[PDB]
């Protein structure tokens, strides 16, 4: 089985030797690939629709990019920054010499709620509803390659002066809980004679200020040299210095931070839980959707619960099952060799990487029960006295006054849901309580017969 | 003699395979070159003094740089940008007192005025004074290699984002009129089987002016934050020519980085021709540049003052007007230019002969004694209010615009290169020329030598 870190390395290596080609108006697929193949073998490719037809081409060898860049020219007022974004037109527009087939468009966004509801209503069980949702919403192989490519393009800027750099995606994009249309969270990562011979190199300041200057410049580069980047927003003074930007070629909204290797460990953690049992993913997607539908989450930050916080609450829920659906963080820590040992900023972030080594769950609860039980469980959870600990998998006394306390499983000084206020917590608790009520006391078979919402769909519409 | 463009290409190729090594405190020359030679043959090298001992090493093969970079490490924080700047220390510092010869230091600056004056007084003719000055002030072979290396390093740096880039020096650094301690003017220059026209996505901007501004702004910041040796980085992006100024500590040069101004190069080649044509040309410019500085007619900061470039062009016009001319007019060079020497840039014709052998050598035989005094006499009595200087025609013509001092930009015509100059400064110039000419005419040379006093060039190179 593929370990998180193996998958990152592979995906990055693939995106490394990938390019984006704005295709001709009247397009011939075969002639294009035949032509491109002349520069080297093509492992994968696909087409998508983003203000015209674009194609992602993944070569087998990185040299194929160089080869292809050789024959590529500048449109003779531009900034001559040469990246892996191409525009292909015909030399002789009047030499079209084959039948026109239509190309398959890989979708890059999910169907909206209003269209999803019908499909859910026409399913058999609530279990199947959640799996329909999961399939309609989850990242596709294509979308993923496109996410890693975005990172790969941003990497190329940074390497100008930090040659060993990488830009690594973290968060929902890579932890199996990613849905179509979600943002790409990126962080920039940096790691004889009679003479001692050293390069002269400019010293940097302390961590935080170096970060700020590096991002400020890279931001400006994206804004001024980089094709496709718009709405570049420097938020350098946050707790984690950050640059936000929109990347039009791939259509992703993006977040670029520096060197937070703790967040990665948690992204790997969530990846494990996501990979362990398909019910885990199914449940997160439906409940993330639920939260959005009732206005418990928001696109902008504030007093609301966040998807990440909500996700962690769901992980705690699954830890508490009889028997558990997923092990505690400590239980993974207990199975970690010294090769899986990582200590970062003083904090232990050690846990098993190999998935085979984990004892598969004996739990057999259906998603029907788990969904309603989630609403029941947190609807009757004493938030004022108890806090969520994912290391121990137990309710414990709150170390601090905060309406909703969830123990940051790595930087254990912290409350990840610290932002949440009492009002929003209560609106969450009331929605859970109403939600659980609806599922318990609804007459399923009659709703189907009446052409009405039931199960998942019933709770995925405003009250 | 080689052609401007041939010389640039060669100098750049040499600087391409050159490096800088901050040397040990107690240095052994032989052991160092012996060691460095292991990585490949060394065509040239020398040492200079810039806050400690540095050495320039020019290998015969570019691979020697790669070889040497292989064994070089990072100082164990820093920006890991690997360039051609090295620091060499001793593994066992207290196991040797092997001081070198001590090593010869190639000077990189000229002696000051106060020391130069004696040497001038001690010469025979005014002609010889000017040539002493010329030799004391002009660029040395070493300083030149160091200038091209600066450009070569900035090139590599720029090439981080723009792999096909080149950085070319222009101005006094390469037009034969360069003196020790003058700034390095650089400009950044940019240089199908199958059924497809394949082209990059790039942002379409309004003018080429804006691209320039953004490219320099970023490169400036990169020099400031990531680049080794660069300090005092100043973005002057809104000038007539967008510019970044910076100090480069390894070579100790103050530098000016602009983008893609291939007109200025043509004028740098023009001045190179005039400089190469006759040694009196260079001699006269150096002495008169020095003269101007001494009397406060020029300044280090820009403003109402005449500039060295403007002053240089005035001297070129003077030499055009001789009987017979010491140098041909720009048009006369334009007339001798083949279609290979034809260049049209931004609409402007900048065509003129490159080959120096093709130009008719001057029949003029005036001595520098006469020319110097005649310069002061000529411009002291020049009607600046009516007449303007045209170096294409080599003639006084009516001023196209109200401006105290008008000199026709020989390429971008309908520009006045001395536009900045106001009436007061022009007059202070005219008065200094008039006094200067008077002193040379009515001075009793032999008596001044006998009296242990300044004479000729030295007489006019001290405040009045
Ligand atoms: N308070 C926090 N405490 C610990 N880690 C955090 C916190 N906030 C964000 N992170 C980490 O940063 C990653 C990305 O942040 P978010 O984009 O806000 O959330 P997300 O997991 O990516 O899900 P989305 O983007 O809302 S669908 C999270 O997955 C965490 O690894
Ligand atoms: N007012 C100007 N008008 C036209 N061209 C100019 C002007 N100023 C500078 N240039 C051009 O830029 C080149 C370099 O500018 P400068 O560094 O200011 O002068 P310079 O020739 O290097 O002599 P120095 O540095 O004063 S000794 C000049 O040789 C011109 O080609
Ligand atoms: Mg995210
Ligand atoms: Mg200069």
Author numbering:
A (entry chain A): 51 to 126, 131 to 245, 256 to 527
B (entry chain B): 51 to 126, 131 to 245, 255 to 527
The authors write:
In chicken mtPAP, the corresponding residue is N472. The structure was virtually identical to the WT-ATPγS structure with a well-defined density for the ATPγS and no changes in the conformations of the surrounding residues. However, the second adenine ring, which takes the presumed position of an aligned incoming 3′ RNA base in the WT structure, was missing from both protomers in the N472D mtPAP–ATPγS complex. By itself, N472 does not determine specificity toward ATP, but its mutation to aspartate is implicated in the human SPAX4 disease phenotype characterized by drastic shortening of mRNA poly(A) tails.
In mitochondria, mRNAs are polyadenylated by mtPAP. In our work, we purified an active form of chicken mtPAP and determined the crystal structures of the mature wild-type (WT) enzyme (residues 37–568) alone and in complex with ATPγS, UTP, GTP and CTP substrates to 1.82–3.1 Å resolution. The purified mtPAP crystallized as a dimer as observed in solution. mtPAP consisted of an N-terminal domain (NTD: 52–194 aa) and (using the domain nomenclature of the DNA Pol β family) of palm (195–341 aa) and fingers (342–527 aa) domains. The palm domain is composed of three α-helices (α6–α8) and a mixed five-stranded β-sheet core (β5–β6–β8–β9–β10) that forms one wall of the active site and harbors the catalytic triad conserved in all members of the Pol β family: D237, located at the base of β6; D239 on strand β6; and D319, which belongs to β10.
